[PDB]
């Protein structure tokens, strides 16, 4: 898997065990993501922190 980095111009290949890409938002998915990369498990949404995960190259 390849996943976009914080500015999705750049990207990396995920290490072993991380087969999701993610975007992390402060409060709302209608904002500039505040973190991006590879991840093992898609974290649960919380009151102020939202995660969008996906499983294809550079989907984040």
Residue numbers in the entry: 1 to 60
Task: Reproduce passages from the article.
Structures of hexagonal (with three molecules in the asymmetric unit denoted A, B, and C) and orthorhombic (with six molecules in an asymmetric unit denoted A, B, C, D, E, and F) crystal forms were solved at 2.3 and 2.6 Å-resolution, respectively. Analysis of the 2Fo-Fc electron density map of the 2.3Å structure revealed that the correct variant is the LLVK sequence. The average value of the B-factor of protein atoms amounts to 38.9 Å2 and 98.5 Å2 in the hexagonal and the orthorhombic form, respectively. This indicates that the hexagonal form is more ordered. The most ordered molecules in the hexagonal and the orthorhombic structure are B and A, respectively. Subunit B of the hexagonal form was further used for conformational analysis and comparison with other NMR or X-ray structures. A root-mean-square deviation (RMSD) between coordinates of Cα atoms of molecule B in the hexagonal crystal form superimposed on the other two molecules ranges from 0.26 to 0.34 Å. Unusual conformation of the loop-2 in all subunits of the hexagonal and most subunits of the orthorhombic form was similar to that found by NMR for cytotoxin 1 from N. oxiana (5NQ4) in DPC micelle. For the first time, in this work the structure similar to the membrane-bound conformation of functionally important loop-2 of an S-type CT was observed in the two crystal forms. Apparently, these conformational changes are caused by the repulsion of loop-2 from its neighbor molecules in the crystal cell.
Cobra cytotoxins (CTs) belong to the three-fingered protein family and possess membrane activity. Three-finger toxins (TFTs) are disulfide-rich proteins from the venoms of cobras, kraits, coral, and some other snakes. Their fold features three distinct β-structural “fingers”, emerging from a globular core stapled by four conserved disulfide bridges. Cardiotoxins, or cytotoxins (CTs), are one of the largest groups of TFTs, affecting the integrity of lipid membranes, and/or influencing the activity of membrane proteins and the associated signaling cascades. For the first time, a spatial model of CT13Nn with both “water” and “membrane” conformations of the central loop (loop-2) were determined by X-ray crystallography.
